[model samples]
Target chain A: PISEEEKEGLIEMREEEKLARDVYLTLYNKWKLQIFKNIAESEQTHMDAVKYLLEKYNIPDPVKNDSIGVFSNPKFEELYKKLVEKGDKSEVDALKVGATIEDLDIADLEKWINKTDNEDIKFVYENLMKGSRNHMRAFVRMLNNYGSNYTPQYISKEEYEEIISSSTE
Target chain B: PISEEEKEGLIEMREEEKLARDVYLTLYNKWKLQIFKNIAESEQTHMDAVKYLLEKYNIPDPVKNDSIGVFSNPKFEELYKKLVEKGDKSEVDALKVGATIEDLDIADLEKWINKTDNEDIKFVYENLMKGSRNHMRAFVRMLNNYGSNYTPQYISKEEYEEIISSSTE
Candidate 1:
């Protein structure tokens, strides 16, 4: 039997990954950045990984309408609204937010990964965090290219430095 | 030495493929259709096919921006403006224009294929048209799902019936 945190973890991660995908897709349209396009596609894969676990555990899916900026999680729905608008101001802001999303993904996954003792859940969450680190690397470099910098939005500065400094996760 | 027709064919087809990619990406933003997202990604592949031939002939590449709605070709720039706005109105319009792009792509490729006797160009051109046919199938079915039908915008009615009727391209 699944614990409450495990169920919530699956549901929350699903929406969070959707948040990343939906936000990048919106920003891609705004700035026409290929970085946003590639990362958005990657987020879809990450989102789908959680979805398969949802099916495995028979968790009812939360994402009924997967339009850009629409989210079932109320916080994510609000987060997407604010984030997309902020990124709409400039290409630099768009790239910065892309980094922020990955940073946030890394933070949240750690908590959920700790909460779950399920071996299957642990396996996917670990893999998902690794994917987030790679995206974090991609987003930060684009900011570097644009004469901009991204401070830790959700992850600690140490973790941020380590991630941005690495060639690959 | 490459003939003028061969050079122009590679350059023209590159812009045409970019046109299709740009339009679908813009429409995907407007309507959030999965169809546009998938096809826009596919059009990039088609555009890249001609890019390979451009390298083979050492032809100057026409696509410098690779952004949505930004075309180096003057005609394509204007056409993208008109086509994307047409798709901006409704989902059904977006899907219909997708079908129209593939229809137009297939028609244009036939002329270019006929004009060039270069074996590599012939091989790539043939394969590119095959892709257009598959995209045509994907788009028309979406229109059908929306309680709509697509009349041929750039191909003959006989050809339209033949394509839309096919289960596989």
Candidate 2:
């Protein structure tokens, strides 16, 4: 049986993945850039992974019956609008938005990893973190291609450096 | 077994679905508009459905190794960039972009549906056409809400009017 923390984490992570997918999809459309489309698809797979856990545990999905851009959590509703607006500025700004989302995803996945002892949950979270790290590198590389750099917003400067320095997974 | 015409249709439709997903995602990100996000997700599902057909028929996937915004067809590459640039002009332009894509999708699905004898292909194309029509209505409604109207760019104006006149699927 899943613990309360694990259950809550599953729900939130599902939404988080949706957030990434939604944002990346928008960015891909706006700039016609390749990275956003690639990562957005990856984000969909991540969302599905968490959805599997929800079904296994019989947890009521927080996103059920929700429309696009409509979030069960009020906080996400605000963040979605804010992130989209930020990314709307320019392609470079959009790349930063991508990097920022991965940073947050990595951090949140780590936090949730510690709160769960379930093998399946741990496995999924670790894989998601790995994906986020690779995504961060992709976004940062694109940012550098544009002669712009991204500073860590949610993750530490050290962690961000470690992620960007690593080769693709 | 699929015919040469059907095989070619599958390849193009898969990429076409990707185009919609890519475009709507960007629009969603740009305007933080709910309709774009909603349709973008639906487009992903449409892309996957084509992928399934590709795998079942043992056909090589055109998008398998390509990056986002990269199309195997030169015509699509040009069209993709043009659509994104047009949509980038403003929020209303973005919504019209959504309508324009669905308009094209509906027309293409009809053409391909008549070319195939496979029941599975027919079913999928019918459903996809239904989805495109629904998406067209959503985009038009949103466009009207903004005091803007969309003129059909690819499909006949008669077909466009018929689609908008219909209720949701």
Candidate 3:
């Protein structure tokens, strides 16, 4: 059984996940692409999972508000323009972006989960981490499907030695 | 007054934002570069804002954990190898990787904000969304300042039309 405080925390987590999911959904709608849509669904699922956690806490469902002003940052506007530009031109590159972001998400979620002593939160984070890892794979697969050479390459000790040797050059 | 449910939701949004911030901090640590470190600081600010929201809910602070495995995917392992192998080649490539990740983060955050109903939650999402936007800009600025001219050119409809229309004459 989770504590009331932990349940509230889960509710908070769900709300945050919803924000992320909504953002992805907007991009998918603008681009009209299946992959983006699919990714959006993954986020939605994430939000749902958190929602479950919230409901378990006996929290009420969320309500929408238009005055929140979610996109006031000038920097995000510029980045959005760039994403629109790239996603418009070549989804391959866009997917690469998606893969990289997922990579970061996986890393963060894993660490956050590990730090939490709550079993429910930890389980949620672990599950989300799995989803993010899978999402990264999906993005990479999408990139490879576009005829781009995405072969994974590893480095040997000699290469590491070379990098160290050429430190200043 | 914000309902406890809404407050909880907003707190969750902050947690997600902090997750992103922590991930970047780790990245900054790995590279030990000032530019990334600066960006990581910016992410910390975003995390702070979320923390404020969490406090509003009177929730106990969740601890930060760095040992959690965020990425267990084989594909990410591959990308890491490639990234490590090319770390010394050109900063452009590195920024490209960074830029791509930021772009996706921007897209996802934007969509997430769109789906929210609570004013506080939306307010938090909107501001947090900007952090990602700034991160992308910073990467672009860094690439231009120290790296190559590979700023992943934005694509307009004209460029798309030109590409498809110019084929097979």
Candidate 4:
């Protein structure tokens, strides 16, 4: 059953995935780091994954503009620029921004997964959350190599540690 | 004093930098690669550096919105989304997109640098050109790691070789 929340989740997820992809693409050029390129490709897949549900439900795609960083959500618009500005400060700052993104993704991924009773939606969110978990670990480990660590911003500290301690999901 | 053309260049450069930044950021989230995140941050600096010129000359800023992929120039707007779509295809494609961006950056930087006699603009372009050279090297080298190579899309073959053969500028 496609509840209103499930439909809203699909719309928001699509935009959010795009938001991450566009931001990482911008950061790749700025810092000359290859990691951004690697993950930007992943976000594209994430966006498309959710798109499957949207198509099945006949929901109009919210992504009218395929341009990088342009969001249907105004808050996303602000967040994209805000992040670019922060990451622009330095390479480490860029990594921190990455960790921040994963933190938010996992937090939101869990939220929406809990809202739906549909098996398809649950299945999609389940897989998406796994990727988010992997990404969160990736960003964290990348930060460690630079002699830095990321504190949880969106996910609870205990949850962050639990995920960080586990092997890539 | 800024000429009409110089003003135009400043406007175009700002938007182009934003365009690159936004695209890589999107790609980063898509691919789970950190290189895009690094360079995306670099593009943020590039965008701001040009913003300085706009402020210095009191040229009314063309970048009214800091949102990623949103451009005052229609072509740049098109180009950002196009690259994001291309990079989303695969990891190799993302790196190819990175090289393509640097190729375009160098070509356009040279074009604008030639158009202006102002020392500030010249200096900015020269330093920016140096950074673009380094980035070109970085992307090409990354492609090499995957047993791949890139062809020049915007610059001449001879110039591409010349830049490629050289160490980080």
Candidate 5:
């Protein structure tokens, strides 16, 4: 059985993943960039991954019946507006926004992973962290192509460097 | 006579322009991208424009005897490392780095322009702003061709839109 903290983390992360999906979808619509479209789909899978744990733990889904861009937390609501506006500025900005979201996602996942003693919860968080790092690599590589760089806001600089310096797994 | 504030802004901006020129030249050497080579040359002219004003005002040059990537301000020194690492990742990143630098240049020029009453300083600032905007357009357009976008960090979203939405001057 998962603790209340672990359950809350799962619920929050589900929304966080949704935040990434929704932001990418909004950017994809505006810019029609393939990276946005592709990553937005991946973010959906991540949301479902968190959802799997929520159902397993008998936790009520916080994101159920919510429309795209809507969020249970007011903070996320504000962030959605801010990120989409930033992404709307340019394709390069959009990509950086994507990387930034993943950076945040990975950090949160690691935090939750450390808190959980449940094997299943730990497993899912580990895999999700890996996925986020891979996503970060994709966005960073694309950013690099445009002769741009992304500084990590959520993760350590060393961690960010490790993610970007490696090839996709 | 230029205010002390304006004089300091001029000195700082001249080095900032050099920052652009030096970064672009380094990226050009690494990637041989025509965009970097072209923009690096334009940045030199911008540097010279500011230099002319510094000479007219008889202020000491802040960048005198400094090598490429060297800055009197430690903040700029750190930024130079960060930017070059990002640009070194790919040709596309180099172009976006160029755009990011120009975005910063235009915003700073506008700030200094607003603070000054001198006709000559204002004139140079205005022309430099135009050139930086033009450079932004070039980088953004090139980014779009590669199916990418850029979000302005230094300028407002409305301003970024107005610049990118219009054709190069």
Candidate 6:
């Protein structure tokens, strides 16, 4: 049996996962690229997996709640722009960001396992945490293999003017 | 002039950035990879930029808070596992995860800029936010250039398993 705090925490986590999935799907559609699309699916799978865990505990699906932006904090925004710029330029940056996010996920999973005393929860958390770490390594390899600068260069005057005119208004 | 709330926000942002940069450095070292190392430098630059803005406003640094382990709940384990499993087998999948994280950053930055009133603070915030958006774009491009599949696999199952266990224990 899970405590109320544990149950609420799970609900919040699902909401965040849903938000992440939705956001990724929107971006994938905008980018209209296979990689982006595929990633969006992966994020969906992640949410699905979370849903499975929630069910195991007989907890109501917390993801049904309308507020889906628990992780939509300001710092995440700062990181997102950097990744987009990197992805726009080269494959290397994408891989780096992927690796970093997975690493963060792995760290989080460990903490989650510590907080829960339920055996089933512990088992699921351990497996999932290991998986995230693996994802980090895979991306790290691509980043290292493809040695390219992901930073955008200074735009030509025409392009800069166009960007300014369109973005400013 | 920066208001008290603005100062508090910057301090919080800086602390978040600091944690991100510090964590990146740790991973970069662990990976012993150049791309990771290079990006670690980039994160340092980000931290410096945030610090400069804070200093300009005479805002003392806030408490050394870090990224909340939002992913670290039993409920999120399945989602985490799937994300990891998706990325572990394909470099492209890993890049996509990176792209998602970057996108989140860009959105957050845009929101922050809209909320903040300080002219100097807004100026710096916009620039940093731009960097994050660009980074995400770069990751997207990298994913497009490479042909791959999302096959779930573990890169270092034993090591990750041990690390996670120890952390939780």
What DockQ does candidate 2 have relative to the true complex?
0.03
At residue A40, candidate 4 shows an lDDT of 90
* Local accuracy of candidate 3 as per-residue lDDT tens digits, B1-169: 5565555454444454444444444445445557666765776677677777667767654422211111223333244334433432445665665555455445555565665666776776776655555666666666768744333333333532343334222
lDDT of 4 by residue, A1-169 (tens): 6878789989988888887898888888677688888989999899999888899999988876566666777878788989987887888899999888878888988999888888888888888788878987888888899999999999899999999999986
TM-score of chain B of each: 0.96, 0.94, 0.58, 0.96, 0.96, 0.59
**lDDT score, candidate 5:** 0.84
lDDT of 4 by residue, B56-92 (tens): 8899877755656656678997898788878877888
What tens digits encode model 1's per-residue C-alpha lDDT throughout B1-169?
7798789888989999999988887777667889898988988998888898799878998875454555567888788867876776789988988988899889999888888778888889999888998899998888889999888978899988887778775
Please name the candidate that would achieve the greatest TM-score relative to the true structure: 4
Among these predicted structures, which one has the highest DockQ? 4
What is the C-alpha local distance difference test score of candidate 3?
A: 0.52
Compute each candidate's TM-score over C-alphas: 0.52, 0.53, 0.36, 0.56, 0.50, 0.36
Clashing pairs in 2: A25-B25, A26-B25, A26-B26, A29-B26, A30-B26
Candidate 1 lDDT over residue span A1-169, tens digit each: 7897789989999999999998888788767879889989999998899999899888998876555554567899788868876886788998888988888899999999888789989899999899999988888888989998898978898988988777885
| lDDT winner, 3 or 4 | 4
Interface RMSD of each: 7.1, 10.2, 15.7, 8.3, 21.9, 15.4
Per-residue error at A33 for model 5, in Å?
1.0
Task: List lDDT for all candidates, in order.
Answer: 0.85, 0.85, 0.52, 0.85, 0.84, 0.50
Off by over 4 Å in 4: B1-169
The CAPRI category of model 3 is incorrect
State the weakest 10-residue window (summed lDDT) of model 2 chain B: B64-73
Instruction: Return the lDDT, model 3, position B55.
Output: 75
TM-score of chain A of 2: 0.96
RMSD of 6: 24.0
lDDT per residue (tens digit) for residues A3-115 in model 3:
66555455444544444454455446444558777877787788778767666766764422111112223333344334444543456666655654455455456445655
Between prediction 3 and prediction 4, the one with superior TM-score is 4
